[PDB]
Paper text:
Here, to understand the differences between PRC2 containing EZH1 or EZH2, we determined the cryo-EM structure of PRC2:EZH1 with two accessory factors, AEBP2 and JARID2. Using a five-component PRC2 containing human EZH1, EED, SUZ12, RBAP48, and AEBP2, we determined a structure at 4.1-Å resolution. The addition of a biologically active fragment of JARID2, containing residues 96–367, allowed us to improve the resolution to 3.9 Å. Overall, PRC2:EZH1 displays the expected bipartite structure with an upper catalytic lobe containing EZH1, EED, and the C-terminal VEFS domain of SUZ12, and a lower regulatory lobe containing RBAP48, the N terminus of SUZ12, the C terminus of AEBP2, as well as the JARID2 fragment. The two lobes are linked primarily through extensive interactions of SUZ12 with both EZH1 and RBAP48. Aside from a different build of AEBP2, the overall structure of PRC2:EZH1 is very similar to that of PRC2:EZH228. However, we did note that several loops are disordered in both PRC2:EZH1 and PRC2:EZH2, making us wonder whether any functional differences could be explained by differences contained in these loops. Indeed, sequence alignment of these loops between EZH1 and EZH2 revealed several differences in basic and acidic patches. We also observe this same loop interacting with the acidic surface of RBAP48 in our structure of monomeric PRC2:EZH1. While AEBP2 and JARID2 have a stabilizing effect on monomeric PRC2, AEBP2 seems to inhibit the formation of PRC2 dimers.
Numbering used by the authors:
A (entry chain C): 78 to 146, 155 to 167, 182 to 216, 229 to 256, 295 to 322, 352 to 361, 427 to 482, 485 to 533, ...
B (entry chain A): 31 to 73, 80 to 124, 272 to 322, 432 to 477, 518 to 727
C (entry chain D): 5 to 91, 111 to 410
D (entry chain F): 150 to 172
E (entry chain B): 76 to 440
F (entry chain E): 396 to 439, 443 to 464, 466 to 499
The structure:
Amino acid sequence: HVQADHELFLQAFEKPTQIYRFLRTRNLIAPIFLHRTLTYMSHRNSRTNIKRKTFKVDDMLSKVEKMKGAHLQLTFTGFFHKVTLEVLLVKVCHKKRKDVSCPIRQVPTGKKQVPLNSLAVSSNEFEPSNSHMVKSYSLLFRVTRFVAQMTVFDKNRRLQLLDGEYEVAMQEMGPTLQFTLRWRIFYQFLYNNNTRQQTEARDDLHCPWCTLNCRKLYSLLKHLKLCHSRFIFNYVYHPARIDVSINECYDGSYAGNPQDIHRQPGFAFSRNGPVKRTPITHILVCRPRTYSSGHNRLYFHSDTCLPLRPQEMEVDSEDEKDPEWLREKTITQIEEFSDVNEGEKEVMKLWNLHVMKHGFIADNQMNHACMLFVENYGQKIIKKNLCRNFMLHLVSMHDFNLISIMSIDKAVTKLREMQQ
Amino acid sequence: RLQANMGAKALYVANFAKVQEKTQILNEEWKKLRVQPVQSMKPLKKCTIESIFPGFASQHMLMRSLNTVALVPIMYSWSPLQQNFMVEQCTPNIDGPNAKSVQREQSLHSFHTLFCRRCFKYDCFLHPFHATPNVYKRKVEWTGAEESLFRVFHGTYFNNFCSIARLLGTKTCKQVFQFAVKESLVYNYQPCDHPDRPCDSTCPCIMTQNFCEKFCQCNPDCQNRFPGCRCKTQCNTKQCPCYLAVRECDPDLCLTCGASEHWDCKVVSCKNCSIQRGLKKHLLLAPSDVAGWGTFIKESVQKNEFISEYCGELISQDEADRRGKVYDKYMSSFLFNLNNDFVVDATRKGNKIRFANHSVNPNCYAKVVMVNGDHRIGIFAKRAIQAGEELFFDY
Amino acid sequence: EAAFDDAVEERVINEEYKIWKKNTPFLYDLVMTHALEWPSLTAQWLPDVTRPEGKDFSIHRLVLGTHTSDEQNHLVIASVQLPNDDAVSGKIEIEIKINHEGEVNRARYMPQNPCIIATKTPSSDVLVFDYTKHPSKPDPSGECNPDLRLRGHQKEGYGLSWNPNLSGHLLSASDDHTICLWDISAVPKEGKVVDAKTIFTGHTAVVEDVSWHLLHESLFGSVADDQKLMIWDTRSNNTSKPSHSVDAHTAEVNCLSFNPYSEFILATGSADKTVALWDLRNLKLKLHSFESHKDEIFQVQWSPHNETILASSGTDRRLNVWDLSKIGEEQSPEDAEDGPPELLFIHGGHTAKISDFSWNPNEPWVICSVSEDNIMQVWQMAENIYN
Amino acid sequence: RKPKTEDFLTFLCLRGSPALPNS
Amino acid sequence: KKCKYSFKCVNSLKEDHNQPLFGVQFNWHSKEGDPLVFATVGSNRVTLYECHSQGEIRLLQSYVDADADENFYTCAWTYDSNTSHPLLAVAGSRGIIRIINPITMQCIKHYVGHGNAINELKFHPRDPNLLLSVSKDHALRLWNIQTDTLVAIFGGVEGHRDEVLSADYDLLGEKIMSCGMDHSLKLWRINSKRMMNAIKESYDYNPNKTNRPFISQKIHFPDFSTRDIHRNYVDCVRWLGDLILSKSCENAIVCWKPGKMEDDIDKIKPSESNVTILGRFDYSQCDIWYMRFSMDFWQKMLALGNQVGKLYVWDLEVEDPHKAKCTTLTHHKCGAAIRQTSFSRDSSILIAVCDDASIWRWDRL
Amino acid sequence: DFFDAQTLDAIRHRAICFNLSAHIESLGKGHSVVFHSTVIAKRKGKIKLLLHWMPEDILPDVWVNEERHQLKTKVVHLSKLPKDTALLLDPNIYRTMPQK
Ligand SMILES: [Zn+2]
Ligand SMILES: [Zn+2]
Ligand SMILES: [Zn+2]
Ligand SMILES: [Zn+2]
Ligand SMILES: [Zn+2]
Ligand SMILES: [Zn+2]
Ligand SMILES: [Zn+2]
Ligand SMILES: [Zn+2]
């Protein structure tokens, strides 16, 4: 076992377990779905729907009805270190929608000289207004020649600090100041069919990286199978054995509108404002397989291989309206012919462009096809004097018994009637 | 032999002169611009640069990442197609001034040898050689161009003076009459030539184990020819005569199904002539979740529905063998054997249906069909396929 | 700084969406993840229903708005196929698309006449459509054909509500400190434009939700961004003083909803990361404040088939649903680690702002939801959860 | 075996970063 | 004549990764008098560098992509028309063409339309918005970054039948040459009405106003081809006025032009086959693939490297190129193969890269 | 796919910083933040000490009576913390996507 594949193995089990270690705290503090509501994991719940039978919403209020059944003289003192001091009320309000920082308001009362090595009166100057706007009211003590705050008002309008004498530390930008207030499983890893590591579960069923306390093994197995799908788990009773194995066929993609992938910057997200995508319909359960109708994956052009926007998918359907390189090839191939004249090559390329612009396989439709040609390029041949070789080509196709001769008479008479 | 050294020196100094004045005007253009300089950040990974020469300190700098990007698989260049492909006296202009007399057989020599019956084109990309010249055989002042025109006109008409007088316009009936008075004195389809003899064992059609068609110039009262279907319904079943053999419907013969209707629309009864009309589904390109690229379908289909048709360059067996031997390095073998004579190679040219992959559980399939003698591919559906699903068929 | 945080958060959201896609076949009886061509700021089930006796799946109908940019807005009446008690098939189909003046912010159907649908606009002039009169396809020219226009505001908004008892009585809100009330029953058929029957102005901030009281047509309720709820009596001839006014929240209030079974109890959802439950007999005491949502809430709807059930959703990308009967109940510690006991479910299958959601009035415990990232989900929780 | 499950992940999560997780 | 060049090795840096470099290009578009700047590139490590009179190569910026398996090949410098900011352009084996704005130090733009590795990038000299890109996929591409789209594809059925290795505009920006492993040196044109009005429609493109895709004007027919100038691979080709300079693994530069000596460059047909070998320059030890030479803005001289380290310099102002006085430069430490060299706007500074992560500098005296 | 070194290195660095500041894997046993008290202030009648915690100001300056030694190191679950201030540990735990 050289160090190269060992470190590769280490990184390959470091990145998904790092992602899961982040997702551990994420789903603990911000869960995605309640684990109690899972069918294979319901032992975590510890109640039933009995109380819903006897409940009555209108009788709730009486229950909470039975649940409902100052001169702040802040006196300073001599500091303990090795000056003047000022008191201030710091009102911290609630977070509004428009603002991201909390509202803070520092009302300084007044300064006073105090020794080292006065008082301030407040006759009911809380100014909270009882409007559900004062989240907290702290008392800051500014000094000079060390500043710090302390939570005075609690959440429920309760008092935190006691009355009488007291002391508190401080921090500029031991030293303090004084004042006087007064109102068993075992994972068996496997990479390239090699027993790289063998361990034993410390706890009985506490997940190793998710850390949920499930009192059943089948629920743990289904959780390891469904969640954390980068690995593959197999279990056989043989003390318990668990066979971890990388899934090298993951479905890693955007899992959404993928047209934002190929924006100008790398992997943009058009969250601000709307954006168009193609329609889809995914259905996974109806009465407990999958079934996905429509299209939800990005596309690319045929010849250019650039990204295809969702707005133009049905409109301007590529691979129709046959390309120009075939036209240029038909031009240069007959131009390469030596013993052919100029006007003959001209009417040859005109007939090639005509039959390519409108495909004709039916024989009888050829009787109409010449009638389109004078109706499509007649004005061109008068601009080049190709009527004689055009009639020669008409007689040439007539030699193969494709058209009748009175149709050719009608065609040339119609062509020469408009020419005059 | 060596009478261009001084000329080469002259051309080189002239090159130096013109590139010098070109660089001068480029400098004059560049002097107008005023761009800002680069500015670094105040110095996670690190990057240090040493110095082999002493006297210069080692310069460190913190690393700066870059925004990632979605990789795609490998694709070699190509171009689209809809039809198959194949790779292996002067007689002046009638309208020009220097025209001269020429007989009927020599005048139409370049036209008949280059004109093709099975596609109605000149020098197409699948018919290398014309069969025979007997296929078109049937039962006052005068310039050489007018002589040849009167010759071919009287050849097709056999002395119908009023008709030539109507067609030419300038020339009258009496003039043409007076001139004519003083004038006398599992194998590819291949059309064969045996007009006098009947269809017998020596004909190559029965040797190829295939039925004759309209393009062959044999007896019209033969039995080896394949008459078209006579089904009023869409004829997509086994009971149709065309569906017994690998052939598809005929435009002229299959009159019961209604294949000879106008091709401008798309709602038609015959659900078998989609290869001729080209009612293909709007496929799309995407990266496959199995191996590299893949083709997706837009609209929903049903069982045995017409998805598309494969296309590529037709080549011989040994040709495709050496081509695969060359592409073994690039390991991109999109080949598809057609029959014993010819096979398809689509690496350089093709359509989206090439990009499908191999799998043990397919959903589509291929079938050879002799459309008007041309042995084309048809990719149909072996299962009801929803939109945006992958396509797989065994090679 | 912020862009890289948003990028890695989008990566983590995609990972969580993949985890949800893996784990979803043990939580719900029905799941239908559909993406629309354009997003939708509104979704509502209609009471009509069709039940083919030969087939196993029933048909239901949805009203949906749109919010586009440099493209015509199409108000959508769509259909959906719900299996009832059997069966792995069912798709979405768009029945009617009607050209709309500008974008859409809110849309509500009349409970008396379900064909009549009131809709808001990004301008003052809200309007009302009747799709039975309109054709079954849109006009490519883009000139919309409004059936009954309505004016009286000076700006846009989100609030809209029909009166369930009295026909034509329609309330609407706007951020110009006004609440319009119209009565379309009085105008003749020839009159396509109607002036404000009355305008109420008692708030002092951006009003963001109003709703008629269900079993008493003579009053309604409202909540605004002045941290204020206001109950307005219609009998009084003073359009400034309300019937009641309460500072029901600490921050800007966003949504409200009345109970279908009861008449006094109601719920609100505000921007201080909370839902609250109130009673219309003593509005001074806050009964309870449900606090699991972590951001601004934007929609709450009581369930039609149950009384003690509540729902909420916002820009947190996780739709919460709560049970009131399970309130204040003791539970295991590990049961409390996931969340409070009253919190019944957290449908976190979305990947963007949950813009709107709604219940069905004739199926049990099923809802639809629409997000801003062109996502329209429908789902019904498992029977084992609620029993 | 003697190396437990959690001990490995902690060393593994750090991946040599100086978290000083007992190893 | 004498050498007339007093060159001396002023500095020789070595990086801390030991991966062979593949390209180097100076910021010619910068103005006069500013602090000069250039940039090298490894496999997944691009590094900008300053330069002073006393050899103090001050490191300025160094970006690295997350995908370590990518193998970068070349770099280029450009200026913006509106913002008047600089822009580096880079690519590699992943099939991507990134555009770095070094002021903001981000990946402001990226384009992807190739299947496999990019071999070289170039920019149209007069109009600074176009961007030609060579690739291993038997075709070239042309991007427009002001409107963020593609213009045309200089490849197809008539293109190279193997990997394409290099390409270059002319100095006026009206004709492009391209060479590769298929033993072909094919000419193109960007002066006809088709390319001009296609570029104009690309400039007039906007996906928000209308709703259509771009009409990509493919080019399946070059204006001149030949398979007799060389036998082995053609690693690099450049323009000199209306003459074609080219190299190969045969250890010789060849200077030639299409057709006869009197045939003008602006009137060559597609079926033209005759050539004219105007001159040759001799050297040795250049068997390895992916080797390059370089010129200045004035093109008064030429520089080349070899697979041992002893680089070479040739003059161009004097007459008689095949009798031109060459110049060699050696050292007792360049024990690796050189891949590319470059100069500044003027001929004062010369910087070369090598496969041992070494970056050598030379200066006039 | 969709998880490159650009996000992975930042996630690893922030996780290492959070583990160093909280000691989740070492002392927390994977599911507990371990806070340490500090002598912030005191007030004497009956004594009462106000203590501020070590890692950040997410928790309040808690008052206690004469279990001062027991509160030297307090383990607490993540969900047990207040929801309104549990985001300062790592700001990508939850962040509003559109930001407006
Ligand atoms: Zn787990
Ligand atoms: Zn043909
Ligand atoms: Zn025969
Ligand atoms: Zn025959
Ligand atoms: Zn026959
Ligand atoms: Zn048939
Ligand atoms: Zn037929
Ligand atoms: Zn038929």
